[PDB]
Amino acid sequence: DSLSKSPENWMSKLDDGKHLTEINIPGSHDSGSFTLKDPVKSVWAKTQDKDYLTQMKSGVRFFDIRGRASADNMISVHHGMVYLHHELGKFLDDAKYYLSAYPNETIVMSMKKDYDSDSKVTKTFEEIFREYYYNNPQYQNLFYTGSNANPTLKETKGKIVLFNRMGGTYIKSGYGADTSGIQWADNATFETKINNGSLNLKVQDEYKDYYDKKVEAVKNLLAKAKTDSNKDNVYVNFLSVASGGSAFNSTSNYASHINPEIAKTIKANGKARTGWLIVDYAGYTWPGYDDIVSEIIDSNKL
């Protein structure tokens, strides 16, 4: 039966000789915003309703963590200026928990600075992360620490792989884990080499697109992956967009239309390569419509 019928451990059912890049992974955009309760603020800043554990249980393996240095030793999880009511340790503890219960899954954790540090901070966001999280004895053995620029599932399962969106780092393990980091173009479909030129990263992140243009842009990169069997190529495809302060298309409205449209498209493509697709309201179902998380998972040929 479909891998999507057991999302708690779908990576356990793959050949762990595969590079993560070759694996079709569902991700959650601004994963940590499930904590938002304010109705007005939630229209444009709430991107998820399931907590980290439930997201994982629903089969999400790519986590989009954007944050802000709150103290010289603390990173708070943020959607821009909006604080999401927890620090990075919360997500790390939930991941460590889940990975222990499901030891043949891997988690790719993206890390980005979304907002200006607290006036008391004397450190860079990167330095705080490297020193107080990555190299923290508390999170010993949690992170992938190997030196493969293109790690395999075997090499990473049970661990969190860093997807570096912090700029240059002195961390030496994970995606964009060098002094160059990842050159990220603003509101664009783009292509850049990462990990000392080892990998070719292809990103659709047009987060300001109006609906029709967004679907076109997701589908464009979706099509390219389909006929791309190169393991040194990695695809990250965001289905999410910014809502804005006022209007009729609450992130939930947008998601309720694009998610099924892409899910339906993936399903028709059969077991073809999709890349890593990052969505709002991962695991959220609308009766009568295909589930994007489920179809991303099922698209993997075993």
Experimentally, how was this structure solved?
Answer: X-ray
DSSP 154: H
In the set 29, 78, 85, 257, the catalytic residue is 29
Is residue 212 within 8 A of residue 180, CB to CB? The reply is no
What is d(CA 77, CA 178) in angstroms, rounded to the nearest whole number? Answer: 23
- Catalytic residue, chosen from 19, 78, 79, 85, is 79
Query: Does residue 106 contact residue 20 with C-beta atoms inside 8 Å?
Result: yes
Q: Give the angle subtended at the CA of 25 by the CAs of 238 and 141, to the nearest 5°.
A: 115
19 is an active site residue: no
86 counts as catalytic: no
Whether residue 116 contacts residue 170, with contact meaning beta carbons closer than 8 Å, is answered with no
3-state secondary structure of 283: coil
Q: 17, 111, 142, 129: which is closest to 71 by C-alpha?
A: 129
Q: Which helix (H) or strand (E) holds 187?
A: none
Q: What is the CATH number of the domain that holds 242?
A: 3.20.20.190
B/e letters for 263-296, b = 16+ CB within 10 Å, e = fewer, are bebbeebeebbbbbbbbbbbbbeeeeebbbbbbb
Decide: 157 and 106 in contact? Cβ < 8 Å. Answer: yes
At 175, give phi and psi (nearest 5°). Answer: -85, 125
DSSP annotation of 233 reads E
Q: Domain residues for 197?
A: 1-302
Judge contact between 240 and 279, C-beta under 8 A: yes
Q: Which residues of 145-172 are buried (b: 16+ CB within 10 A; e: fewer)?
A: eeeebbbbbebbbbbbbbbbbbbebebe
For 19, which DSSP code?
Answer: B
Task: Give the resolution in Å.
Answer: 2.3
Question: How many domains does the structure of the chain reveal?
Answer: 1
Q: Which residues lie closer than 8 Å to 159 by C-beta, 6 or more apart?
A: 99, 106, 107, 141, 142, 143, 144
